[PDB]
C-alpha cells in the first residue's frame, strides 16, 4: 500500500506537470503570433480556446 500510494502520487505529479506544461506552451505558441502584431483582429474565439 505504501509503494502503491507513493507511485500514484508520483504519477499524478508528473502527469499534472506535463499537462500544465503542454497547455501553457500551447498558449504561448498560440498567442505569441498576435503579441508581435498589436493591430490584429484577435478573434474572441482565440481568447477562449488558447487561454
Amino acid at each position: 500500500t505504501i509503494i502503491g500510494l507513493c507511485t500514484c502520487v508520483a504519477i499524478i505529479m508528473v502527469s499534472c506537470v506535463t499537462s500544465v506544461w503542454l497547455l501553457c506552451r500551447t498558449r504561448n505558441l498560440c498567442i505569441t503570433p498576435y503579441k508581435l502584431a498589436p493591430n490584429a483582429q484577435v478573434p474572441i474565439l482565440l481568447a477562449l480556446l488558447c487561454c
Binding site: T32, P38, A40
Partner: protein, 151 residues
C-alpha cells in the same frame, strides 16, 4: 534613431529595432544592445520567429515604427538600398546584405515596416531574404526560403 547596433566584443553582431512600442532583435545574436535605454529591457523569447521582444520606455513609444501588412508586389526600401518583392519573397542584388545585417527592417514608401530581415540565401546573381512579416490577416509569420541561413 530607428536601428540600434548590437555589440558582442566591440564589433556589431546585429541590429535591434523598435516597432509600435515593441523592440525586436535576433534571437541567435549574442551581445548587448548599444543603447542604455534598450539594454535595460528584459525581453521575452519567441522561438517561432527566432526573435526576442518587449516593451520600450515611455520616452521612445512616441517615435516607434508603424506596423503595416499591405505588401503589394514591387520595390521596397531598406538600410542597404531597395528590396524587390516578388512571388511573396524579398530578394536583393548579390552582395547586398550579409553576416551582421540580421534584424534590419524593410519599409515601404510610406515609412511603415513590412518585414524584419533575419537571414537570406546566397544565390549566383541574387539573394533571397529570410524575414518575419505578417499575412493578409495581420498575424506574424516567418518566411524562410529553402537554404536560408541566419545572418
Amino acid at each position: 534613431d530607428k536601428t540600434f547596433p548590437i555589440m558582442l566584443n566591440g564589433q556589431v553582431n546585429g541590429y535591434a529595432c523598435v516597432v509600435g512600442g515593441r523592440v525586436f532583435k535576433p534571437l541567435h545574436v549574442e551581445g548587448r544592445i548599444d543603447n542604455e535605454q534598450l539594454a535595460a529591457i528584459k525581453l521575452k523569447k519567441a522561438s517561432i520567429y527566432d526573435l526576442e521582444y518587449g516593451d520600450v520606455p515611455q520616452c521612445m513609444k512616441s517615435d516607434t515604427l508603424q506596423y503595416t501588412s499591405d505588401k503589394p508586389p514591387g520595390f521596397y526600401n531598406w538600410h542597404h538600398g531597395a528590396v524587390q518583392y516578388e512571388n511573396n519573397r524579398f530578394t536583393v542584388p548579390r552582395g547586398v546584405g550579409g553576416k551582421g545585417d540580421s534584424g534590419r527592417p524593410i519599409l515601404d514608401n510610406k515609412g511603415r515596416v513590412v518585414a524584419i530581415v533575419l537571414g537570406g540565401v546566397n544565390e549566383g546573381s541574387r539573394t533571397a531574404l529570410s524575414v518575419v512579416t505578417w499575412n493578409q490577416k495581420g498575424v506574424t509569420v516567418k518566411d524562410t526560403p529553402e537554404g536560408s541561413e541566419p545572418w
